Amino acid sequence: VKYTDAQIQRLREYGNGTYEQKVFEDLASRDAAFSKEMSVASTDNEKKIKGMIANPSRHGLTQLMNDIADALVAEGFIEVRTPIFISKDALARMTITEDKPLFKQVFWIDEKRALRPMLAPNIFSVGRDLRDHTDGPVKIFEMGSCFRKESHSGMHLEEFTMLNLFDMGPRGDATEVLKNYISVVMKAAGLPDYDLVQEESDVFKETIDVEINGQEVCSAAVGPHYLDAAHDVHEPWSGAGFGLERLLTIREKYSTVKKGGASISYLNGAKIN
Amino acid sequence: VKYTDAQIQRLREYGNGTYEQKVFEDLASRDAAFSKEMSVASTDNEKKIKGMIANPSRHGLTQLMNDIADALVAEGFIEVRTPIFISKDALARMTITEDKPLFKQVFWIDEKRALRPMLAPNIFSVGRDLRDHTDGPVKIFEMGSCFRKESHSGMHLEEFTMLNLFDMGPRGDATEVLKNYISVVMKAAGLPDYDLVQEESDVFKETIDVEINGQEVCSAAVGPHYLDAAHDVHEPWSGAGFGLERLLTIREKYSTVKKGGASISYLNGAKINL
Ligand SMILES: Nc1ncnc2c1ncn2[C@@H]1O[C@H](COP(=O)(O)OP(=O)(O)NP(=O)(O)O)[C@@H](O)[C@H]1O
Ligand SMILES: Nc1ncnc2c1ncn2[C@@H]1O[C@H](COP(=O)(O)OP(=O)(O)NP(=O)(O)O)[C@@H](O)[C@H]1O
Ligand SMILES: [Mg+2]
Ligand SMILES: [Mg+2]
Ligand SMILES: [Mg+2]
Ligand SMILES: [Mg+2]
Ligand SMILES: [Mg+2]
Ligand SMILES: [Mg+2]
Ligand SMILES: [Mg+2]
Ligand SMILES: [Mg+2]
Ligand SMILES: [Mg+2]
Ligand SMILES: [Mg+2]
Ligand SMILES: [Mg+2]
C-alpha cells in the first residue's frame, strides 16, 4: 500500500519532500509513516521560519525577479511597469472578444476594464509608442502580477507573476534572437536545463514554449505576427512570457506553486500557520 | 495674470517644470508663454525617452523599492509578498465596512473578494502567524500594488504601490520605534527632510502621517489598538504604510504621481504618446 491521494496532498501542503513513491507493508505502517512525515515537515517549517527570523532576506520571488531583471538590463532592455487594469479594446486586439468562452475567464472590474491576464497588451502598446522615438530596436520587459480564473492545480494560481520581454526590430533573425534571450533568462533563473516545444494556442495559434520535465514555464512567439496589425506593429520582433512562480517552484523543488509566491499561508516555501 | 487651472493641468501632463507660480503682464503674454513651455516640455520628453533607450535601466519605481527594501532587510525585516485579493471578512476586521468612505473606494472582484486597498490586513495576518515561532519582535514588510477608486488628483492613482512595514512586539516604545524606522525609509528613499503630523483616520481613529511640504507620503499607527482583537494581536506594534509613487514623485520633482508609476502613457517621468 502507498499513501492515499489525500495523505499525499496533506504532506505536500506542509512539506516539500517526495511522498508518492513510498510503499508500506500494511495500512498501520502507512499511517505511522504519515504521522512521522507530518512531524518532520512541521519541524522543517519551524526551522526555516526561525532561520528567516534570525537571518532576514529579500523574498525568494523578489530575488529571482532581480536576478533576471538585471540580466535583461545588461542585454539592453528597458524595464517598464504598466497598469494591472486593461481595457476591453486591449483584450480584443489579442482576439479575446466578447462572445468567446475565454472572455468570461478574465476578472472584470466593470463593463470596460478587467485585470490583465497577460502583460502582452500593455507591452505591445508601450513598445509601439517607444518606436516613435528611436530608429533602433525597442527592448522592454516587465515583471508583474497577472490574473486568471483557474481550476485547482498544483501549477496554477489566480494571481501569478509574469515576466514579459519584448524586442521589436531585433538585430537578427527573430527566432534565433528569441532563443538567445530565453537562454539568458533561464540561466539567470538558475535553470539552464530546459526544452523548447511548439505548442498549440488559441490566442497565438502556436507558441514556442519552454518546458522542464513537461511543465510549461514560458510561452513565446516571434514577429511578423498576425496580431501585429491590431497593434500597429510593422517589423519583426521577439517576445516571451515566463511564469516566475513556476520557475521558482521547479528550482527550489517546492511541492506546489503556492509556496514560493504571494501568500498568507506560506513564506519562502514554509507553511507559517 | 496667471495660467488657468486647465493650462496648469496640461503643462503638468507633458512637462515637469513648475508653472503655478508664473505670472504674466497680460493675456497675450500668458498665451505665448503657454506654447513655449509646451515646446520646452515636449523637447525634454523626447530627450528623456532617447536617453532611456541609449541608457536602459531598471524602472525608477523599482530602484526606489530595492533601495528601501534592502535598508529594511538590513534592520532585520523579512520581506513578504501577499495576495492582491482580500476577503470581505478581512476588510471588515479592518473596520472597512459599508459606512466608511474608504469602503466606497474598494474595487470588488465578486461578492466576497476585493482588490486590497491597503496591505495592512495581510500584514497583520502574516505577522501574527510568525509570532508563534519566535520570542522576539516580528518584523516584516511588503511592497505591492493597492487599489482605490479616486477622483482626478495629481497625487492619486487607482493603482499605487504601498510599502507597509510591521514591527510586532517592538524593542522600545512603539511610537518611538515607529519614528526610527520612518527615518530609515525616508533616508533610504533620499528624502531626509520631512515632518510628522497627527491626522484623523476612519480606520485607525488616529494616524501619525509623514509629510513633505505638507503632502502626505505615509500613514502610520501603533498598537495596542482596537483593531488588535480581530487580528488576535495581544502586544504593542509599529506599522507604517508609504506611498512609493508619492515618494518618487517628490524626490524626482515630477509634476504628478502618474509619471513615475505603472503606466502606458509615461515612462520614468516622460510622456511617450499624445
Ligand atoms: N494560473 C497560472 N499560474 C501560474 N503561472 C501561470 C498561470 N497561467 C500561466 N502561467 C505562466 O505564464 C506563462 C505565459 O502564459 P500562458 O502561456 O498564456 O499560460 P498558459 O499557456 O495558459 N499555461 P497553462 O495554463 O499551464 O497551459 C505560462 O507559460 C506559465 O508559465
Ligand atoms: N490613491 C492613491 N494613490 C497613490 N498613493 C496613495 C493613494 N492612496 C493612498 N496613497 C499612499 O498610501 C499611504 C497610505 O494610505 P492611506 O493613508 O490610507 O491613504 P490616505 O489616507 O487616503 N491619503 P490621501 O488619500 O492623500 O488623503 C498614503 O499616505 C499615501 O502616501
Ligand atoms: Mg509527492
Ligand atoms: Mg541577486
Ligand atoms: Mg504576457
Ligand atoms: Mg492556462
Ligand atoms: Mg500549457
Ligand atoms: Mg502558454
Ligand atoms: Mg485617500
Ligand atoms: Mg497598508
Ligand atoms: Mg524592534
Ligand atoms: Mg490625506
Ligand atoms: Mg493616510
Author numbering:
A (entry chain B): 3 to 275
B (entry chain A): 3 to 276
Please quote the paper that reports this structure:
Transplanting known mutations from a promiscuous Methanosarcina mazei pyrrolysyl‐tRNA synthetase (MmPylRSIFGFF) into a single domain PylRS from Methanomethylophilus alvus (MaPylRSIFGFF) provided a variant with improved efficiency and specificity for 3‐methyl‐L‐histidine (MeHis) incorporation. The MaPylRSIFGFF clone was further characterized using in vitro biochemical assays and x‐ray crystallography. The structure of the C‐terminal catalytic domain of MaPylRS is similar to that of MmPylRS and MbPylRS. MaPylRS lacks an N‐terminal tRNA binding domain that is essential for activity in MmPylRS and MbPylRS, and consequently it is inherently more stable to purification, more amenable to kinetic and structural characterization, and provides opportunities to produce proteins containing ncAAs using cell free expression systems (Gottfried‐Lee et al., 2022; Herring et al., 2007; Jiang & Krzycki, 2012; Seki et al., 2020).
To develop MaPylRS for encoding MeHis, mutations from MmPylRSIFGFF (L305I Y306F L309G C348F Y384F) were mapped onto MaPylRS through alignment of published structures and sequences (Karvan et al., 2007; Seki et al., 2020). The resulting MaPylRSIFGFF (L125I, Y126F, M129G, V168F, and Y206F) variant was evaluated using a GFP production assay and its activity compared to the existing Mm system. Efforts to obtain crystal structures with the amino acid substrate MeHis bound were unsuccessful, and the active site is instead occupied by an exogenous triethylene glycol from the crystallization buffer. As observed in published structures of MaPylRS variants, AMP‐PNP is coordinated by three octahedral magnesium ions, which in turn are coordinated by water and the sidechains of residues E218, and S221 (Gottfried‐Lee et al., 2022). The flexible loop spanning residues 150–160 adopts a similar pose to that observed in AMP‐PNP/ATP bound structures of PylRS homologs. In our structure, the loop harboring residues 199–210 adopts a “closed” conformation, plausibly due to the presence of triethylene glycol positioned in the amino acid binding pocket. Remarkably, in addition to its increased efficiency, MaPylRSIFGFF also displays enhanced specificity compared with MmPylRSIFGFF and has negligible activity toward the histidine analogue 3‐Pyr. Consistent with our in vivo assays, MaPylRSIFGFF can adenylate MeHis with a rate of 0.59 ± 0.05 min−1 at 10 mM substrate concentration. In contrast, no activity is observed using 3‐Pyr as a substrate. Similarly, regioisomeric amino acids 1‐methyl‐histidine and 2‐pyridylalanine are not substrates for MaPylRSIFGFF. These data confirm that the increased selectivity observed with MaPylRSIFGFF arises from the specificity of amino acid adenylation rather than downstream transfer of the activated amino acid to the tRNA.
